[PDB]
Amino acid sequence: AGRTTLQYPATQVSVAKNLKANEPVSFTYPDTSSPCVAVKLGSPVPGGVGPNNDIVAYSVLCTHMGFPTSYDKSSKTFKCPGHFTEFDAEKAGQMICGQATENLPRVLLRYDEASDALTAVGVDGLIYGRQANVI
Amino acid sequence: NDRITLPPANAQRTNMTCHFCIVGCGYHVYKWPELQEGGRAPEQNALGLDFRKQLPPLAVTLTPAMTNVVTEHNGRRYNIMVVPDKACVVNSGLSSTRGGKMASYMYTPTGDGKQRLKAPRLYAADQWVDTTWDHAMALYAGLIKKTLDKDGPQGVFFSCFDHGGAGGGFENTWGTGKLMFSAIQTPMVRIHNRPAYNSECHATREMGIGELNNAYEDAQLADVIWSIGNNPYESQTNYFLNHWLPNLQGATTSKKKERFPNENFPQARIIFVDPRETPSVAIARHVAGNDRVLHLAIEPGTDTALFNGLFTYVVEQGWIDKPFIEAHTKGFDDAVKTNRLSLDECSNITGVPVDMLKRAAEWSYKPKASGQAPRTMHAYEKGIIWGNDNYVIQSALLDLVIATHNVGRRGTGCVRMGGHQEGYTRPPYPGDKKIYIDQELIKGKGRIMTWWGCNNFQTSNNAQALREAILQRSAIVKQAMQKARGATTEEMVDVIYEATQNGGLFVTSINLYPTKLAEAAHLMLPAAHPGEMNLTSMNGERRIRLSEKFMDPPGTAMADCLIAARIANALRDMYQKDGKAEMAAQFEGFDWKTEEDAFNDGFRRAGQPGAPAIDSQGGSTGHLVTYDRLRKSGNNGVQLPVVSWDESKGLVGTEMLYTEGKFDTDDGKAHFKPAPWNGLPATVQQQKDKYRFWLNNGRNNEVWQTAYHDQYNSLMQERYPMAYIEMNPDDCKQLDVTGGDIVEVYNDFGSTFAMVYPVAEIKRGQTFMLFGYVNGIQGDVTTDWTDRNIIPYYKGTWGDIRKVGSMEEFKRTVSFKSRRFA
Amino acid sequence: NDRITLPPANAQRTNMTCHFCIVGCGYHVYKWPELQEGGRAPEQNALGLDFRKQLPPLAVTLTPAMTNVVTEHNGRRYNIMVVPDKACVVNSGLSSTRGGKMASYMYTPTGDGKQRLKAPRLYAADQWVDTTWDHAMALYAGLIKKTLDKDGPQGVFFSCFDHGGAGGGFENTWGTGKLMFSAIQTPMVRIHNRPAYNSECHATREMGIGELNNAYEDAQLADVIWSIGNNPYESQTNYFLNHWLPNLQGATTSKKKERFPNENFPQARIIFVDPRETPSVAIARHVAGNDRVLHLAIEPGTDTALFNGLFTYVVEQGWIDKPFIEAHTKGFDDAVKTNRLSLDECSNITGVPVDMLKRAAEWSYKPKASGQAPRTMHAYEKGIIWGNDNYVIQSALLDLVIATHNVGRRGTGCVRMGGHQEGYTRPPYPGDKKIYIDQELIKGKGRIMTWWGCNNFQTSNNAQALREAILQRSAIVKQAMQKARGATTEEMVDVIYEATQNGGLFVTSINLYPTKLAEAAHLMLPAAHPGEMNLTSMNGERRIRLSEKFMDPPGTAMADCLIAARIANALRDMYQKDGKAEMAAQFEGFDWKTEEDAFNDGFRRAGQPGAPAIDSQGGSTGHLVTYDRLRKSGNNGVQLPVVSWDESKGLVGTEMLYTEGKFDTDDGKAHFKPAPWNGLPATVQQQKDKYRFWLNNGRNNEVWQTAYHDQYNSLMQERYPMAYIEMNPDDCKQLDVTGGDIVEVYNDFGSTFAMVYPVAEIKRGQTFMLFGYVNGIQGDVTTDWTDRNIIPYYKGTWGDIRKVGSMEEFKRTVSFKSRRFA
Ligand SMILES: Nc1nc2c(c(=O)[nH]1)N[C@H]1C(S)=C(S)[C@@H](COP(=O)(O)OP(=O)(O)OC[C@H]3O[C@@H](n4cnc5c(=O)[nH]c(N)nc54)[C@H](O)[C@@H]3O)O[C@H]1N2
Ligand SMILES: Nc1nc2c(c(=O)[nH]1)N[C@H]1C(S)=C(S)[C@@H](COP(=O)(O)OP(=O)(O)OC[C@H]3O[C@@H](n4cnc5c(=O)[nH]c(N)nc54)[C@H](O)[C@@H]3O)O[C@H]1N2
Ligand SMILES: Nc1nc2c(c(=O)[nH]1)N[C@H]1C(S)=C(S)[C@@H](COP(=O)(O)OP(=O)(O)OC[C@H]3O[C@@H](n4cnc5c(=O)[nH]c(N)nc54)[C@H](O)[C@@H]3O)O[C@H]1N2
Ligand SMILES: Nc1nc2c(c(=O)[nH]1)N[C@H]1C(S)=C(S)[C@@H](COP(=O)(O)OP(=O)(O)OC[C@H]3O[C@@H](n4cnc5c(=O)[nH]c(N)nc54)[C@H](O)[C@@H]3O)O[C@H]1N2
Ligand code: F3S
Ligand code: F3S
Ligand code: FES
Ligand SMILES: [Mo+4]
Ligand SMILES: [Mo+4]
Ligand code: NA
Ligand code: NA
Ligand SMILES: [O]
């Protein structure tokens, strides 16, 4: 091979200006079995993208035992119904409380000013239930 | 990152019990050469899972934190993968956040375990250096010998683990206890979590009920579970998750009905006695509904009043087992008189409304329609063990349980939830008095103090008084050592001993890590944890398992029992050399090459012919357990005591204690005890009189104990860079603090520091601070007060709070969002 | 492991000078997102190297140690690769083992830098805790202010770097110097490597010859190189490798001949003055043959006698430049009289045979056949700088050099080899006396002491006396702090100040790491190193380079110059608040947002109109240097002083000093000095009289300085788990020691510990211990003795050796094989 990196796809999510503050968008990345959310937080955070540096994206599969987590708009967290793990959308998937041993994986977005496009280009962290992010 | 190396199909697999909490969840350790891997096809990897497509929920627990690469003493590198056993009855494949990190917290030269103690460390007056094991033994044994010869055993002090799992277990408790008690014969010994040689459970034992009297299956069969002074989602996670919650969800109903065809089983309910609304309360509400959870949010320290009012009420209603009382108990009528308290009085003291008191009794004790009393499991932990008068609370609680026949019936029990695992086998304690060891040390007693698998700088009650005294006394020895040049070991022993006659104290720590004890220690010895050694221990239902060795320790790190043998043999050799045959004989019986030898000498000898007096949780049938028999048992092990063994059946043990109504007392009866309500202790009341906040304290789900591994984990330190204090938002506004501000917390006992964590569920004038931590030690503000058996009221202290300032970096990186799930 | 991620073709590339030694080798830092990589084809990676097939020798320097993955403040992950620049003139693509590790020693959360200081740390009486920057400044500035108001500047102590490279450089020396000298105006300041505010080079500077007077190209043009008190293969690797060895190999002969058409150039030769046979001696013999190397293995401390004998001889033979002496020098005839020593007396003192003395003069000073004196570069370092009377040795050596016209000719120079890089720009020192700072501290002076970018617990002379005193004084402050409860910052300042009136000392460390200073420090502030900041510095031939920022510091770690500005602005604010406009005005001039601002304020203002007095290595043309101009220059930079600049030419600088015979003295002449031979100092002689072994000390090739990074590196710790002492094998046998035994080394000054390293080349009754180390501090046994300018004779001590015992682990894991290549 040579290669030490996974071959991630480049997947269009949307243009940034279509996202409303605190209204999660669903997409799949890096394939149709990996559910993800992108959300405009409404306020800049470290590593947020877009015009207001505030768009973040995640794998929604709990890194404990893999249940799809749900985005809570009031707390801006992802909550797992399995064993009650909760992840902070504003702290790069930091576990607030729970049984996981890994932060919620971040979907890396490129933001292109010229087109206003958000493209999913990678994952930081390992998605639940996978030997590698790219199957 | 973004991939994992799978275990090959033919990978080596050993059994490991979780290093940490009481639950004792079962895990498998997969070990294979670094340059090999498994295929994604399910039959081409050791997990048997299909990694050619996304796995569904519950199929696995597997993250990079559950993997490592170890370097063995031969220089060869091996992948390890430490994952929960799906077929273990304790956890059914669940891993907590704490156990899930075991792979990461194995020793590797570059990982989280990189700072593991690898050789003896010596503070040579003015600097840390390595030294040899032989020099270390010469100095340490030399000192102990000199102290024995001149002062007797009363000059030699220990604080040592008495517990199970990692840094305890049957091998290690025997080794240390044989050394301290049979050989050295010192009474100047405290325990890792309490400052004398005592029990947490004097009252319940004396009333004839050992504190681990049921099975985890009992939590499945109960109508009602009480969690008293107990945060079990955070503190006993997988017992709560795998046993309690299935009951609350109705998954166990059909099993109750199959066992008891003519008994009604309503939807299960749960009662929490805790001043604080915890994650456990929140998650119980989420799962069961608000209508099946009662949070009895008592006033701090009022548990005795609570139970006396409930006992009085169930007696007055006749919601008691009168045939049980008459046949199997003693002292009931006395306890009715001494413990009498009206629900009105109870409500005034506890702050719990009378309606809630009545409801808790109705759910728990009133006959069901089919005629039978509810099966009510009463589970308690440190909210009452470190509560307002440990002995009296247990007296009050057990009286309620015994009168309601909630011991010895399936689905019942009055039990410790537990802390660590258990693994006690020791000679009897060689004194006839309880001794408050920290007070002795602070008063300038003792020549040599050994901390062994504990760190009381972080975990003593009145910890600030302790550290002050120990640092100063350690300094005297440091100062005296530095005048030496070119001294032999024997001359150095005389230098140090002289310094201890002028207030000094020689301090040794036997540990995995330097820890804060390195600030005072003169000598530190490297130990080995499970997987670097074989180790036996039992969980909260007395289920003994063997944790199999699968890798080498760092450097010359040794099993604690073998450290004890090393010490005993050094002492014996010194005595033999000095012509002191009688003294040498006391150090016989440590001819041990492996930890198994400690198992054979202790656990397996208890109660056998020509054995010395041995106090073992295995009992007198412990000899039926061998390492090979435990191996064959798996992570299921056997519940102690073992009742039979043969080749065809395996180990057969004991599910529940006291099912025939024979208790552990002189007459076979359970004994009721008087439980006076005398308010808070005056020392604690004085703090409450002077200062504004109740300084509650205890566990965080993610942090283990003194954070001895967690302190090296980048994720853990990013999450909890400092000890946090949960405060009411309104109290916060009054102090102009928010999330990520640092505060001083202080009283007459001490001053410490915490980062502010606003928590809506905290009551005004109440707080909650993480205990035991590496940055902001909570214990500085705990009082010196202890009950009659020298059990501290660690949860009983008050203090004021002052803003230091805003830590902008904490605000940038730490979540202050809610840890109570809804 | 077994692979590397290549940098993509378009990866970001910045310039970086090596963090560590004087040579200042040029590197490139490749930075790129973690999930990208380069292809193996040479045009598809940033290196331009063909990784489709094996690379030949010399094609690359690339290991996993030269790679890392950093996590930035935005949470994003980036591959980095830190590799030598092939087109840099200094190193021509060479990397030493020390610089080769730079990538590994960049800050990452899980790597070797994991314990980097990331926030202020406070010892709050009895425990370490985090604190805020504002609280830290309130406490630190508060104390400084209190001390200024009550005691004046003489209560405020520093030991601070004056050097270049990482933990130094022009921005940083300016920042610290402006703070200490212009603002606080304290004279109670020492330097990182010496205990007063002085120079290593008083004599040579006062004789008119600054110590960095040539180019590295001069080592290529020389007939003869002297290496005096200098182990340059280990201590100045790539100058030795890239410049010295090519000369010895004949690769530079044709360039000598092209420069000098009418001059003979024999094969180059090399002379080492060093009591010890070092790896540099061995490697020189391997490269050049035994017949072209002279090891003058002098008796310790006899340098002055050596040079006076050579000077006497070259004068008597007439192997001197009489026209040079007459036109360009003063004091020759006096020096001939005062320095007169016969070769027989010289031989008796040095132990060097007369034939070897004569040969060294013959190689070095006797005219070649073509008429011209040999081009003899005289290179010296710490064997004489920390030698027997710093001032007198340089006087004697320079007399020889000046008489032989070995300054100012190409292929010559009397130069420091250097230690760190250089990067000095500071106000004048504000006192009129040299003050022995360690002695002052030991005697109980000062309220507050700051260690800034240094660790004198490991590196002071008489280090044991120092540590003892500092720990005790620190303890008094700790004891006073602990009685406080609920005190404001202002009250705490008063409590600590009071403790310092009763013998206490408040200790601050400004550092990358806790270090051993954490045993005494009350406050620790996090600094940032090159790559986390921009930084300028120059090497041993005055070549100034910019090291570019490419990554964020850990947490709130800051550039030292910006920490200084923070402190200055805190003090200014306090004075403005206190209504003291004049005192506030002293803390003006630190309105700095980036390190560049410190560069503009210091280096670029030296000698400009309206500037205050500034002592700068840039001189008065420093304003011509800008960060953008250095960027355009590359890793080649410019040799200072700059002579011209324009857009078309770039920076044009200065190759060699003194080529027209104009020296830095009142009259433009070089000045000879008397150099009396007085034997060893009585303090050192008393040690030699009482004890057996000469306790030589200094550098190991692989270990950098106090092992601040290296202590965390698993390979370094496996190789050198403990400081080693090179011992003669016959002396070893006499003491019953071998490789991996531990010994105590001791004298009247102190006691320390080392692992035994048998070395055949060590002379009987002589030893060599690694200096500065994290396990076994050598400096405990160095004396308090200093020359007239308070320069220690660190290389001058004697002591005895006692066996502690055999460290089995060292024997199993550490190589004791020979480090002298043959
Ligand atoms: N304020 C307050 N104080 C409390 C409590 C509280 O609720 N509130 N709780 C109390 C309780 S219940 C407890 S359990 C104590 C805990 O008090 P400690 O017993 O002091 O704390 P641990 O963190 O359990 O101590 C384990 C130590 O042993 C080391 N270690 C780990 N494995 C081994 C091994 O195999 N061998 C050896 N020799 N060392 C090993 C660890 O590195 C660490 O230093 O704290 C008590 N203190
Ligand atoms: N996550 C995690 N789990 C662990 C540990 C760990 O460090 N981390 N440590 C283990 C050990 S050794 C132990 S001892 C257990 C302890 O586990 P628990 O005892 O379950 O945990 P704690 O947080 O010490 O305290 C329990 C509760 O006591 C309450 N409390 C305080 N004062 C009173 C009072 O007067 N009365 C009553 N009724 N309640 C009161 C507090 O609000 C708290 O929720 O946890 C074990 N499990
Ligand atoms: N016996 C004996 N003693 C000696 C010598 C000897 O030959 N013999 N040699 C002497 C010599 S030549 C020297 S140079 C001294 C060295 O004495 P020191 O200067 O005490 O030692 P170094 O290791 O250079 O110290 C650098 C320190 O600064 C920290 N540091 C690194 N980078 C930075 C940064 O960017 N900022 C800040 N603020 N801190 C930083 C490091 O972690 C470390 O603590 O030792 C001297 N002592
Ligand atoms: N690998 C590595 N290189 C470094 C450093 C490091 O820590 N590691 N530190 C850097 C610094 S700050 C400096 S100052 C330089 C140090 O560079 P050097 O001075 O080159 O190194 P040292 O090992 O201190 O000492 C040089 C020699 O002095 C000899 N010596 C001892 N006593 C005498 C004496 O009385 N007379 C004579 N003539 N020689 C004597 C010793 O035998 C030794 O070989 O190295 C720099 N480079
Ligand atoms: S994994 Fe471990 S920490 Fe307790 S809940 Fe289970 S035994
Ligand atoms: S790589 Fe660094 S250590 Fe010196 S030889 Fe070159 S500057
Ligand atoms: S599957 Fe999500 S918290 Fe367990
Ligand atoms: Mo406990
Ligand atoms: Mo130096
Ligand atoms: Na304190
Ligand atoms: Na010492
Ligand atoms: O415990």
Quick tags:
part of a larger assembly, 3 chains, A: 135 residues, mainly beta, four-stranded antiparallel β-sheet, three-stranded antiparallel β-sheet, 10 strands, 0% helix, 35% strand, B: 822 residues, alpha/beta, 4 domains, seven-stranded mixed β-sheet, globular, binds ligand MGD, binds FE3-S4 cluster, binds FE2/S2 (inorganic) cluster, binds molybdenum(IV) ion, 3Fe-4S (chains B, C), 3 iron, 4 sulfur cluster binding (chains B, C)
Small molecules in complex: ligand MGD, FE3-S4 cluster, FE2/S2 (inorganic) cluster, molybdenum(IV) ion, sodium ion, oxygen atom
Q: Largest contact between protein chains?
A: B-C, 64 and 62 residues
Helical run tally of chain A: 0
Secondary-structure element pattern of chain A, one letter each: EEEEEEEEEE
Helical content class of chain A? under 10%
Beta-strand segment tally of chain B: 31
- Beta-strand share of residues of chain B: 15-25%
Rg for CA atoms of chain B: 26 Å
Into which percent range does the helicity of residues of chain B fall? 25-40%
Largest sheet of chain A: 4 strands, antiparallel
Shape of chain B: globular
Q: What proportion strand of chain A?
A: 25-35%
Structural class of chain B: alpha/beta
Description:
This is part of a larger assembly, with one copy of chain A (135 residues) and two copies of chain B (822 residues). Chain A is mainly beta and 135 residues long. Chain A contains no helices and ten strands. Chain A has strands at 11-15, 25-28, 35-40, 55-59, 70-72, 77-79, 86-88, 94-97, 106-111, 117-124. In chain A, the strands form three sheets. In chain A, strands 5-6-7-8 form a four-stranded antiparallel β-sheet, with no helix packed on it. With 822 residues, chain B is of the alpha/beta class. Chain B folds into four domains: 7-116 and 529-555 and 619-654, no CATH class; 117-198 and 421-528 and 556-618, no CATH class; 199-420 and 655-679, no CATH class; 680-814, no CATH class. Helix content of chain B is 30%, strand content 17%. Chain B contains 27 helices and 31 strands. Chain B has a seven-stranded mixed β-sheet with strand order 6-5-18-17-16-7-8, sandwiched between helices. Chain B has a six-stranded mixed beta barrel with strand order 26-30-27-29-28-31. In chain B, helix 1 (133-150) crosses helix 19 (489-500), helix 1 (133-150) crosses helix 20 and helix 9 (303-317) packs antiparallel against helix 12. Chain B is globular, with a radius of gyration of 26 Å. Chain B starts with 11 loop residues before the first strand and ends in a 9-residue tail after the last helix. Chains in contact: A-B, A-C, B-C. The interface between B and C is large, with 64 and 62 residues. The site of one FE3-S4 cluster has 13 residues of chain C, from helix 6. Chains B, C: Keywords: 3Fe-4S, Iron, Iron-sulfur, Metal-binding, Molybdenum, Oxidoreductase. Chains B, C: Its EC number is 1.20.9.1. Chains B, C: It is an enzyme of class 1 (oxidoreductase). Chains B, C: Heterodimer consisting of a large and a small subunit. Chains B, C: It holds the Pfam family Molybdopterin.
